[PDB]
Amino acid sequence: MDNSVETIELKRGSNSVYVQYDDIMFFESSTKSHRLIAHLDNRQIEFYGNLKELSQLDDRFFRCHNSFVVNRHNIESIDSKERIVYFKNKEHCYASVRNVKKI
DNA sequence: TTTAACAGTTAAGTAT
DNA sequence: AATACTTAACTGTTAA
DSSP states (O other): OOOSSOEEEEEETTEEEEEEGGGEEEEEEOSSTTEEEEEESSOEEEEEOOHHHHHHHOTTEEEEETTEEEEGGGEEEEETTTTEEEETTSOEEEOOTTTGGGO
8 A cells, every 4th residue: 555645446356456646637437337437647447436435535536527526636727618627638528517617 | 697497318326 | 247227316408
C-alpha cells in the first residue's frame, strides 16, 4: 500500500491496481454493466464499482453528470455553455445541465 | 434569475 | 465474475 499519496484500489478480478487519486482525470460508466472506466493520464482501466461511492471518497471527486465523476484537481477548463469538462491530458467529458454550475 | 413537466434513458441493487 | 431483471432517479428540452 502506497501510504504517502492517496490511492484507490481498482479491482479487475484477483488483480488489483492501486492508482494515485491524481493520476485519474475522470471516471465514466462502462458500456459493460456494473463496470466503470478510470481515465488516467494515458491509460484507461475498467473495473467494478459505482460512481456514487467514488464521489463519497473525497471532495475532489465530483458527480458532474449521471455517467461521470471528475477529479477536480485535473480539470484544466470548462466550456460551461456546451457543458464540457477539459482535463490536463486533453481528454474531455460531459457535465449535466443540473450539475455543471456546481463543479 | 428560478423550478419543473415531459418522456426516453441509465446506474446500481439484488439474484444467480 | 458477469450476466439478467428491476426501477428510482437521472437526462436535455421546453416552458412558465
